Design a protein around this ligand. Structure first.
Ligand SMILES: CC(C)(COP(=O)(O)OP(=O)(O)OC[C@H]1O[C@@H](n2cnc3c(N)ncnc32)[C@H](O)[C@@H]1OP(=O)(O)O)[C@@H](O)C(=O)NCCC(=O)NCCS
Ligand SMILES: CC(C)(COP(=O)(O)OP(=O)(O)OC[C@H]1O[C@@H](n2cnc3c(N)ncnc32)[C@H](O)[C@@H]1OP(=O)(O)O)[C@@H](O)C(=O)NCCC(=O)NCCS
Lengths: 430, 428
């Protein structure tokens, strides 16, 4: 029924993924969200990798549902004055433009507070204010490289040798498909903004939330910072693939598809792997019930072999064990492999392609993947991750550029003459 | 502090719930962590680096909490749990499916115990998922959510240095905790939203997040790509275009950059012995001239085979190779400085050692040194900064350190507390 953010007013003053994704979530939870975009072209996502020539790209519609679009050139004195009225209207202002942009536009945090002492200002940059990289261009992959994720993702070089490795020392840092830099930073920003919004109820005061992309990536790599400290003290990482047949250095190495503390595991080929990039499962060799594991893979002999039957003894032979499992499932599809290993309660799970995910009926039924009616496009799918017992979001079309400009100006108190004037002066259009 | 006076129960383990609860404590919440007797949160005993001290896994996830040791499978322990629930504004839980219910603590019951309770629950999958039975481990979530399928290298053309040979390029796990920490962030978002709405409605609610869904959410762009793929049959920005083939599902793209401009991770001097002697580099449309100078290929500036993004598509990997050649004799930092002079966008790949020791990160309070009993100091991460306050981060609790203290605040007499202890409801 009633939505938690009903009557909360938000300005989405950003682009791409971090800020818009957070603002989209706010709208879905009830917020009145207006997106102020540059004239003529709007948010960069509108025009990036279109699949339908005359329509807004999917990048944009999947990040900007339930918003109203305001076209506005804040780099003009008239535009700035309109923006200042918007700022007074809003509870929340979110921005992620390049370092110094807001400042050159006339909007220091000090000034923003002057305009609206209730304002909760959320700002995202690639790096913290004091970083030696503050001048680096902050793309998704730059944040992943800066925050420890690429360093610690992918394969190691050398022993133990495994099929997925590149030859020699060509196993380098690897980018993650997940938006550690973008959407993830948005999540962190939303945490800060909502904490601030709650605190504002008692104090009546706004404040500034700052999240850097590097820091948000690092937060998701908290366990890698854990491992770094273990490594420095202990000299090795016992659960890593390199122990005991490889070599550790002074920094956390890449670990392939390793399971981690107390739950050793790996991603294994299934029938069809040579032509199907997703004919794979994940399988754990658990530190209990080794007996059933042995039977599942046809190694009943291992249940008693002193070289296997203790959690801490199969610690050293895992890759032989993984190979035995793949041999046991080499004739099975991933779904057949899972069903076979489940017979014995060997914990495992399929690797699911985006096609299988997109088509999954259980994800439609739960409201996690939602089909949305979009003009000039038809329908498209979006993701709604967090479920509330009290209400369900009503997800609606993403706005055309400037579709609501005059409606919002009117809502702000501008007469019909000033509105035509602003559009005449090319403040609200190109 | 914005969560001052808010009462929170951490009734979870590992990362998702405890990380969310730790942030809450940092923002001012009064957080108690109810842990099973004797061993407590699994993170306490996992990969200890100091034998008789709690593991770093635990300390980095449980600062600023009080520990209550409690056997919630006993009728005495259940009674205690119920009093805590009535005390609490927020209850967070991530135990295996049906576990809360088996104790009798259904959502329907919790709503009646405390109509103001905000209840956050994490599970591997949605309740009606065909995978609902499956053990919800981090790598499982990454595999179910789309991440592993779309992370790693493709097989076949175009052939590049970091590929496995033949068709041995498979799904790959990300170092980032997509399934665990990321899920706790999503949980926290819903919890803070409901906490706010409670101000107007006066009632709590239940927030549910599945690990599969949280992973999927971070892979929003890959669901975008799936729909693009299904509509047009190819993806313009992927390494496979134009020289490879697209199938029916989004393929792995190695170190490719998203939308804006082509990019890749390039070797620098020392890559044969230093796993992290690398940078990330983007090939910009603008300033192609300086880019050509930067790599000792002035020859390319006027060449219509190269001087436009469109002509470059067919041989983007030739371009990257030339850049690598030009920085073959430079460290990643030297490579960065060289390439920046020509306005080519690039950045170093940083190792965990480099990050952990970074003075800017200590100075901003992003990496924080914490004093911890039986250990000395360790480092933790605090990612969101507030102009209104700065968290005062303190030691993670010893197991049951605050049991008797919390029970006394809950109104238990010293005699009740002593019997609970003697009967081993509050200890092993
Ligand atoms: C993504 C990014 C690199 C884009 O680079 P960019 O397109 O070259 O620069 P921006 O789009 O950020 O900003 C360009 C200018 O447009 C201006 N602008 C923004 N909105 C405007 C509007 N409605 N009207 C007129 N001008 C506007 C900005 O103020 C900025 O002015 P400036 O010349 O004084 O700097 C940059 O936004 C960034 O680093 N963001 C920080 C972290 C982040 O969230 N990145 C997002 C993707 S991972
Ligand atoms: C992490 C996980 C896989 C562990 O599985 P597990 O160790 O076999 O089981 P759990 O630790 O969750 O719970 C075991 C039991 O201890 C009980 N328990 C929890 N706290 C207790 C306490 N203080 N006293 C007594 N019993 C307690 C639980 O109720 C549960 O009871 P049950 O036998 O009726 O099911 C599982 O907790 C999980 O799937 N959680 C959901 C998603 C998640 O966040 N996973 C984290 C890893 S990425």
């Amino acid at each position: 029924n009633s939505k938690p953010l009903d009557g909360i007013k938000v300005i989405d003053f950003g682009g791409v993924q971090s800020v818009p994704s957070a603002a989209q979530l706010l709208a879905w939870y009830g917020a009145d969200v207006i997106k102020i975009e540059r004239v003529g072209v709007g948010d960069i996502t509108r025009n990036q990798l279109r699949d339908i020539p005359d329509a807004d790209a999917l990048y944009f519609t999947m990040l900007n549902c339930n918003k109203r679009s305001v076209e506005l050139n804040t780099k003009t004195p008239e535009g700035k004055a309109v923006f200042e009225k918007c700022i007074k209207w809003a509870d929340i202002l979110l921005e992620n433009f390049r370092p110094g942009a807001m400042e050159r536009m006339g909007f220091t945090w000090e000034y923003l507070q002057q305009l609206n002492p209730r304002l909760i200002y959320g700002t995202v940059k690639g790096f913290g204010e004091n970083s030696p990289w503050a001048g680096v261009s902050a793309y998704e992959n730059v944040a992943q490289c800066a925050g420890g994720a690429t360093s610690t993702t992918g394969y190691w070089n050398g022993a133990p040798l495994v099929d997925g490795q590149a030859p020699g020392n060509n196993n380098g840092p690897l980018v993650s498909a997940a938006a550690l830099g973008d959407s993830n930073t948005g999540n962190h920003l939303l945490i800060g903004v909502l904490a601030a919004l709650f605190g504002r109820e008692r104090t009546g005061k706004g404040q500034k939330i700052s999240v850097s992309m590097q820091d948000a990536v690092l937060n998701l790599c908290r366990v890698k910072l854990r491992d770094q400290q273990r490594l420095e003290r202990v000299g090795y990482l016992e659960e890593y693939p390199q122990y005991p047949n490889g070599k550790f250095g002074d920094t956390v190495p890449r670990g392939g598809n390793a399971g981690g503390g107390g739950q050793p595991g790996w991603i294994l080929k299934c029938k069809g792997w040579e032509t199907d990039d997703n004919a794979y499962i994940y399988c754990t060799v658990q530190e209990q019930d080794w007996g059933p594991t042995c039977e599942a893979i046809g190694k009943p002999e291992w249940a008693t072999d002193p070289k296997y039957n203790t959690a801490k003894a199969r610690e050293t032979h895992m890759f032989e064990i993984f190979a035995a499992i793949e041999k046991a499932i080499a004739d099975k599809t991933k779904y057949e492999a899972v069903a076979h290993l489940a017979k014995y309660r060997v914990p495992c799970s399929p690797v699911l392609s985006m096609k299988e995910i997109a088509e999954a009926p259980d994800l439609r039924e739960s409201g996690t993947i939602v089909e949305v009616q979009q003009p000039k496009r038809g329908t498209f799918l979006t993701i709604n991750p967090i479920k509330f017992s009290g209400f369900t979001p009503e997800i609606k079309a993403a706005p055309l550029l400037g579709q609501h400009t005059d409606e919002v100006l009117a809502e702000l108190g501008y007469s019909a003459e000033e509105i035509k004037s602003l559009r005449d002066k090319k403040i609200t259009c190109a």
